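Researcher: Going back to the complex we discussed earlier. I've cleaned up the inputs and rechecked each line, so this should be the final set. Can you rerun the prediction on the complete assembly and write out the structure?
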Amino acid sequence: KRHRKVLRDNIQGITKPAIRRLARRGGVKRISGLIYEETRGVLKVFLENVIRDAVTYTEHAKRKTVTAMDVVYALKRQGRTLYGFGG
DNA sequence: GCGTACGTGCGTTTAAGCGGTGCTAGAGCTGCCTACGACCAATGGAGCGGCCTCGGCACCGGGATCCCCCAGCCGCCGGCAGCGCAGCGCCTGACGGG
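Model: Rerun complete. Updated structure for the full complex:
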């Protein structure tokens, strides 16, 4: 097809074990059940901040596709530089 | 010390994941044309310097809160000690039995 898109409930795509594994890499031993909801918001809260300016780069370039070279650029402005994709 | 809820484990189950199409959109590049920003020479007046004088603020002194504190004070009530007592089991009568 050529219309519509998946635009619902995708915040639940981050399934409960996925965070549970992620936190294990952080070394936390025991986690209460309440914390799952906050990080999803927190993860989202951080996220569009990265996209919003990333989107801004593309429109100034008058593209339609989002390149990785733009993604790192905004990540530089926010502060967290990334090695391994460009430069 | 209490207790719940989150780790551990088991048993579905399902959507990720793989591998496979098929498409065209959009990025990349080229050709070519234009305009617009740098450059140059002049010009004057906006901005910056130098004085320089009042009053907004500083300072004071005084009077005005106003929270902060707390013993006063009582109410309350429960503990507590004393008192009156309710109920029971035994004590002990009433009266026939032993």
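Model: Worth noting: Residues 30-33, 63-65 of chain A lie near DNA strand B (CB under 10 Å from a C1').
Researcher: Good, that matches what I expected from the previous run.
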